[PDB]
Design an enzyme around this catalytic site. Structure first.
Site, mmCIF file in Angstrom:
data_model
loop_
_atom_site.group_PDB
_atom_site.id
_atom_site.type_symbol
_atom_site.label_atom_id
_atom_site.label_comp_id
_atom_site.label_asym_id
_atom_site.label_seq_id
_atom_site.Cartn_x
_atom_site.Cartn_y
_atom_site.Cartn_z
ATOM 1 N NE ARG A 1 -12.427 4.608 14.079
ATOM 2 C CZ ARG A 1 -11.295 3.990 13.782
ATOM 3 N NH1 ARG A 1 -10.197 4.671 13.517
ATOM 4 N NH2 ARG A 1 -11.256 2.668 13.763
ATOM 5 C CE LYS B 1 -4.397 -2.913 0.233
ATOM 6 N NZ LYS B 1 -4.484 -1.452 -0.125
ATOM 7 C CB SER C 1 -8.297 6.936 4.735
ATOM 8 O OG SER C 1 -8.650 5.760 4.015
ATOM 9 C CB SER D 1 -0.989 0.011 1.161
ATOM 10 O OG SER D 1 -1.786 -1.157 1.154
ATOM 11 N NE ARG E 1 -5.037 5.352 1.250
ATOM 12 C CZ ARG E 1 -4.175 6.244 1.730
ATOM 13 N NH1 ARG E 1 -4.558 7.498 1.880
ATOM 14 N NH2 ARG E 1 -2.947 5.872 2.107
#
Ligand SMILES: [Zn+2]
EC number: 5.4.2.2
Length: 455
Positions: free
Chosen positions: A413, A110, A319, A100, A239
């Site tokens: 969180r 993945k 993200s 990544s 992304r």
């Protein structure tokens, strides 16, 4: 095998250390076995541009082959191109060998099996197969497949730009360099390349567009060249980060507002998913145009599952993973999302700064991080979920504690991978913002009076 490399949404380790060639083999063995159990002998395999790719991938492939699987080796490709392969080839399984956005030494996997992206207990189940010797044996096959030109054509045939644009494209030396600049050019743009040579040494900034510091060169080039837009891809291309012609960073919750307006316009009533870190303004925007907003957990794999469960046409998370089902396949894909963004912007007379600034916005904090301890982080969230008083707020405990009030919201969180609490606050006014910060400050201090609350 080290248990720790088997993570919530992928497998990731340090090559030569926690991820050796032997472990990669046994992982291929586990994945092929799981694929065969689901009736799927055909598995696509791809890798990103990391130094360990060309050799580690052979183990992965051998593991799959030793189960009796029919492997389609697509070579070095962006992650969503591997996802694409597992949608258009004979098989609905696919494995991407990727580390990544992480430093050069990291790699991993993945995993899509018979159309499902594995997460959580499904990833643990792969490790259990290895430990139990619950593994298939067969004499499989390997076929070389060249899928990038099909992917390229697929996108180019469906995207229709209305005006030419000049775009800076920062690939951070990751694998998006194989296609993003050439595809964006072919859509009708001029492309200014930044770090578009694939180089697993990542000798410039690391390819992680979620960190503003990795956007500095992009912002500088956009302004220096009078470009219409800047795009930055992460290491494996699932992304994308966005900067306007004046250099404003556009976060994924704001990008999703533009995408939701467009998708919902063609698809009345469509479900649209976003994570608990996204602006409340996105909820109102989706509802206002007649779409159904669905708030879900952070995490690529979970958002993807939720899309299938709800029939959503579009999803995104903070993200930068953006998932289009409308006109597409439902997987996250920074390259396709960039094409979709260019399509929309090209139809507008305004600059990209003014397209985005037309949208409503709350006053927001940056994302806040508080380092706690690995022993305490989940218990702090539990204490907040069990004992905190939040007044009349709509409380969401899907992923930490989010509280939406009539005029603002707040989230705390726990990070999955680090000993950190992650927070964000917004409100339509400064007075309301301070009121909401104080509720969260007070609830945190009521758990532990020495917590280092910086707001
Ligand atoms: Zn990525």
């Amino acid at each position: 095998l080290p248990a720790s490399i088997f993570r919530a949404y992928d497998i990731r380790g340090v090559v030569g250390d926690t991820l050796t060639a032997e472990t990669a083999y046994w992982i291929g063995r586990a994945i092929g076995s799981e694929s065969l159990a689901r009736g799927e002998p055909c598995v696509a395999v791809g890798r990103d541009g990391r130094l360990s790719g060309p050799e580690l991938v052979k183990q992965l492939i051998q593991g799959l082959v030793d189960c009796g699987c029919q492997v389609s080796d697509v070579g070095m490709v962006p992650t969503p191109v591997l996802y694409y392969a597992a949608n258009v080839l004979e098989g609905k399984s696919g494995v991407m060998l990727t580390g990544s956005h992480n430093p050069p030494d990291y790699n991993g996997f993945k995993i899509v099996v018979a159309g499902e992206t594995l997460a959580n207990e499904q990833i643990q189940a792969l490790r259990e197969r290895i430990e139990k010797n619950d593994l298939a044996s067969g004499v499989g096959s390997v076929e070389q497949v060249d899928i990038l030109p099909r992917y390229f054509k697929q996108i180019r045939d469906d995207i229709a730009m209305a005006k030419p644009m000049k775009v800076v494209v920062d690939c951070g030396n990751g694998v998006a360099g194989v296609i993003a600049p050439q595809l964006i050019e072919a859509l009708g743009c001029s492309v200014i390349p930044l770090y578009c040579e694939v180089d697993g040494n990542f000798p410039n900034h690391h390819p992680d567009p979620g960190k503003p510091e990795n956007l500095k060169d992009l912002i500088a080039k956009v302004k220096a060249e009078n470009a219409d837009l800047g795009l930055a891809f992460d290491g494996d291309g699932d992304r994308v980060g966005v900067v306007t012609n004046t250099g404003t960073i556009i976060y994924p919750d704001r990008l999703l507002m533009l995408f939701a307006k467009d998708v919902v316009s063609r698809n009345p009533g469509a479900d649209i998913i976003f994570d608990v870190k996204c602006t409340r303004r996105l909820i109102a925007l989706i509802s206002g145009y007649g779409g159904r907003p669905v708030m879900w957990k952070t995490g690529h794999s979970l958002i993807k599952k939720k899309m299938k469960e709800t029939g959503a046409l579009l999803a995104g998370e903070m993200s930068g993973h953006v998932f289009f089902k409308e006109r597409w396949f439902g997987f996250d894909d920074g390259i396709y999302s960039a094409a979709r963004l260019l399509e929309i912007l090209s139809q507008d007379q305004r600059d990209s700064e003014h397209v985005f600034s037309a949208f409503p916005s709350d006053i927001s904090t940056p994302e806040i991080n508080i380092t706690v301890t690995e022993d305490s982080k989940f218990a702090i969230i539990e204490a907040l979920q069990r004992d905190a008083q939040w007044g009349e707020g709509n409380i969401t405990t899907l992923d930490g504690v989010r509280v939406d009030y009539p005029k603002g919201w707040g989230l705390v969180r726990a990070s999955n991978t680090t000993p950190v609490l992650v927070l964000r606050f917004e409100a339509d006014t400064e007075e309301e913002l301070e009121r909401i910060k104080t509720v969260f400050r007070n609830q945190l201090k009521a758990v532990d009076s020495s917590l280092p609350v910086p707001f």
